[PDB]
Amino acid sequence: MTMMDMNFKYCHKIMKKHSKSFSYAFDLLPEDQRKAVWAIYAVCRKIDDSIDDIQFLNQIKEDIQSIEKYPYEYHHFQSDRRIMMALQHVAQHKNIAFQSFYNLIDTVYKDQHFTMFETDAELFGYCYGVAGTVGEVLTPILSDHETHQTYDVARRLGESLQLINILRDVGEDFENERIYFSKQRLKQYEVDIAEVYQNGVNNHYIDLWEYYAAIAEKDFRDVMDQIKVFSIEAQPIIELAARIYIEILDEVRQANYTLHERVFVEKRKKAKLFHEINSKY
Ligand SMILES: CC(C)=CCC/C(C)=C\CNCCN[C@H]1[C@@H]2C[C@H]3C[C@@H](C2)C[C@@H]1C3
Ligand SMILES: [Mg+2]
């Protein structure tokens, strides 16, 4: 094991720790591609966590800026050195959309003084900053020749996964004093998340939840229809990652939309999905 390997293996640990699903899918990529993904994932995970004040965040940001400006110089990274070395090594061979990390970093900064979304258009803006940006950074890894269509599809996939994540985590987020459903849509469907956390699901809530789930499902179908924008090796894997995340919607439904635990797709169910897709390819 060279030193860079240990850097990547650390990246890998972070990704697996955070997301059993994406790990399960993206570890199936060829070596070169999966290691790039681990590294991009780890950076983004670290940015997601950096607050816990903004000092570590500013350090990650400066690290990323050094890499962009001086891809081939040795840096003394201020933040997490194993992660940034791996990102640097990625950027020496692929085209990183640096503005997409900055967009993510700005969104994390802002989430500091979070106030509920007035409308869905703000909510979908947040899904872009926290996740669409991530799909954009991955685009060169996952496709042979990047065009605007490839970015578009990857950005939609990211935003959709983010919205599914929001749908899974309503109760956990409410505990951490966050609600991501828009005020407009909460008022329209007659829902009060505090009330629902207290007394359980009713029909208004289910209707509201299902309004957003149908958006997530439509976007997912639109992505699957355009899956050819990606490299042949990544196609089945992106289809796996998406199907696994999507299934989360059916898990929520089966737990009657509970606000009191995180539902999950069993590892054994992941393997079933892989089989179904492996055999279409
Ligand atoms: C797999 C494609 C195309 C995009 C990624 C999908 C996606 C960013 C999130 C969905 N699951 C929650 C992850 N939210 C993201 C933010 C917080 C963690 C660190 C960064 C920023 C990456 C993700 C985890
Ligand atoms: Mg966040």
Alpha-carbon gap, residue 53 to 55, rounded angstroms: 6
Pocket-testing residue among 162, 231, 265, ligand 1, by greatest number of atoms within 8 A of Cβ: 162
Nearest Cα neighbor of 38 from 50, 48, 29, 47 is 29
**Backbone dihedral angles phi then psi of residue 96, each to the nearest 5 degrees:** -85, 135
Technique used: X-ray
Pocket-testing residue among 110, 134, 138, 169, ligand 1, by greatest number of atoms within 8 A of Cβ: 134
**Backbone dihedral angles phi then psi of residue 143, each to the nearest 5 degrees:** -135, 155
Q: With breaks defined as C to next N over 2.5 Å, after which residues does the chain break?
A: 52
Q: Which two tokens stand for residue 268?
A: 């054994």
Nearest Cα neighbor of 26 from 165, 104, 134 is 134
Atom of ligand 1 nearest to the CA of 45: 19
Alpha-carbon gap, residue 23 to 217, rounded angstroms: 22
Instruction: Indicate the domain borders of the chain.
Output: 1-281
Report the topology of domain 1-281. Farnesyl Diphosphate Synthase (1.10.600)
CB-CB neighbours of 204 under 10 Å? 16
Q: Which two tokens stand for residue 21?
A: 């699903």
- Residue 103 is labelled as binding a ligand: no
Residue by residue, DSSP assigns the chain as --HHHHHHHHHHHHHHHH-HHHHHHHTTS-HHHHHHHHHHHHHHHHHHHS---THHHHHHHHHHHHHHH-TTS----SS-HHHHHHHHHHHTTS---HHHHHHHHHHHHHGGG----SSHHHHHHHHIIIIIHHHHHHHHHH-SS--HHHHHHHHHHHHHHHHHHHHH-HHHHHHTT---S-HHHHHHTT--HHHHHHH---HHHHHHHHHHHHHHHHHHHHHHHTGGGS-TTTHHHHHHHHHHHHHHHHHHHHTTT-SSS-----HHHHHHHHHHHHTT-
Ligand 1 neighbourhood includes 150 CB (under 6 angstroms): no
Nearest Cα neighbor of 123 from 155, 154, 162 is 162
CA dihedral over 150, 156, 160, 163, signed as positive or negative? positive
Q: Which two tokens stand for residue 216?
A: 């997530």
Q: Which two tokens stand for residue 59?
A: 């350090």
Resolution in A: 2.0
